[PDB]
Amino acid sequence: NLYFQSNAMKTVTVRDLVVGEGAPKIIVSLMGKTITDVKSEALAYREADFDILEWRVDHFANVTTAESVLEAAGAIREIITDKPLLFTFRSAKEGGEQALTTGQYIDLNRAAVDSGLVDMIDLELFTGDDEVKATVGYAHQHNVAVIMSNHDFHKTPAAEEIVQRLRKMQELGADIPKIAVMPQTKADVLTLLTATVEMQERYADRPIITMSMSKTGVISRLAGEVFGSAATFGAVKKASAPGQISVADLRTVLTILHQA
Amino acid sequence: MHHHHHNLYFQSNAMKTVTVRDLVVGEGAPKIIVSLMGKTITDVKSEALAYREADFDILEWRVDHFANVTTAESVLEAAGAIREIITDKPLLFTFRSAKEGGEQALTTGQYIDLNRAAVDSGLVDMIDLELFTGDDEVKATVGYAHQHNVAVIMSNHDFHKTPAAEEIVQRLRKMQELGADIPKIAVMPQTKADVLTLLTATVEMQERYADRPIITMSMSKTGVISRLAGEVFGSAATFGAVKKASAPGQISVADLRTVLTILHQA
Ligand code: NI
């Protein structure tokens, strides 16, 4: 599992994929309740064009059973063999389907890191600073990269607050700070982009991932190359968050912008 | 002082649209404008015939590239040629002055007389008038175009910097005050933030002050996204390239229509 990190070039390289270089990378979210459902979805996703596979563990029914989680991850790794695998338990208040105690959520990520089956984990910043910092270090001890994340599905904080949150993620050791916000106005989309630019140019020594959700915020999913967001989420069969477009349409736009 | 004894465009203030040759500017996905440049009447004809096959909505004739811009009748001969060739799309007459990057310079009197001649001809559906021409002549010429059912795109360009958002909004508002049917502004980013400043101005103008469509763009490769996001931010049209870009940042019409269509999906 070794991944690379170049602070000077602001890149994170996982499975030969250079996040932070060139056109933004496409992340898709795989959801399945049972082990066989995860296999089925992995076989379907193997036919799609994406760069990073995110397993949304909060959609899995047996999330507190260690052996079941490990079996599902192994199944994905056996089907999708050449793309980085990102392990994400999204909490209900951050956009997901389930909620765990802080301890259960650490056990779960701990076990994912230990297995060697996943290349990256997602850690929610709000989990708690001590908890998060320790877990980041642990992931790094095992050659697992961390996407640190924060999501607001109702509003867009001020740009200064968005920047500060991305700076803290970096301070806590996130390899890739990530923030998703919801616009209530057209200007809010621009606020998210402003924060992206400011963070990326003034403070980051690594890639960042940002997005303004809903149809109104779609542009933020497409303009990463210019504004400084290193990856973007697309939909394979169904959108996992408001505003995602199909992977095919997303790749089309990213390519056009890259070659403009 | 212009008098009529005893072209057609529509505009809806409340819907914020301008309709010319059945094209509804301000509704749905942004419209694509392409620019035709030719030095002689022979070059204009060859380029119009060639462009006829392209996917665009509005044809802009860049009169400043024409060598014989000095005798109005000669300019009207080329306009007729384009009108005979492109019969079903709006034709925008644009002499882009030396002050704003035009390949040429003309005195204000010559510029006003050229645009009056274009209006008189009935061969063009719209004229471009530069905001910075001078208020008395702009107002008079806007009124003159309107008397003839010719729409006006009022324009302003900065190829070296992006003014503050407030200044961009003031210019768009002034265009509306002067009677422009479609205010239009193009600015050049020096930083990534400058691209966002142009979009901020677009949103504020469109939401708070406009009762008509506006056209805005941040030039260069850096500003390309501004040419693509008009549906959400409020820019009603966008310039594309048929064979070669006519301003920095334009992409091919095929790529532009592809992206616009994706963004319009719902
Ligand atoms: Ni008359």
Curated annotation (Swiss-Prot), chain A:
Binding-site residues for 3-dehydroquinate, renumbered to this chain: S29, E54, W55, R56, R90, R221, S240, Q244
Enzyme Commission number(s): 4.2.1.10
Regulation: Inhibited by (2R)-2-methyl-3-dehydroquinic acid.
Protein's GO biological process: 3,4-dihydroxybenzoate biosynthetic process; amino acid biosynthetic process; aromatic amino acid family biosynthetic process; chorismate biosynthetic process
Top EC class, one word: lyase
SUPFAM superfamilies listed in its UniProt record: Aldolase
InterPro entries given in the database record: 3-dehydroquinate_DH_AS (IPR018508), Aldolase_TIM (IPR013785), DHquinase_I (IPR001381), Type-I_3-dehydroquinase (IPR050146)
PROSITE patterns reported in the protein's UniProt record: DEHYDROQUINASE_I
Molecular function terms, GO-annotated: 3-dehydroquinate dehydratase activity
Keywords assigned: Amino-acid biosynthesis, Aromatic amino acid biosynthesis, Lyase, Schiff base
Gene3D superfamilies the UniProt entry points to: Aldolase class I
Active-site residue list: H151 (proton donor/acceptor), K178 (schiff-base intermediate with substrate)
Subunit details: Homodimer.
Family affiliation: Belongs to the type-I 3-dehydroquinase family.
Function, in words: Involved in the third step of the chorismate pathway, which leads to the biosynthesis of aromatic amino acids. Catalyzes the cis-dehydration of 3-dehydroquinate (DHQ) and introduces the first double bond of the aromatic ring to yield 3-dehydroshikimate. The reaction involves the formation of an imine intermediate between the keto group of 3-dehydroquinate and the epsilon-amino group of a Lys-178 at the active site.
Name the UniProt record assigns to this protein: 3-dehydroquinate dehydratase
Protein species of origin: Salmonella typhimurium (strain LT2 / SGSC1412 / ATCC 700720)
Gene designation: aroD
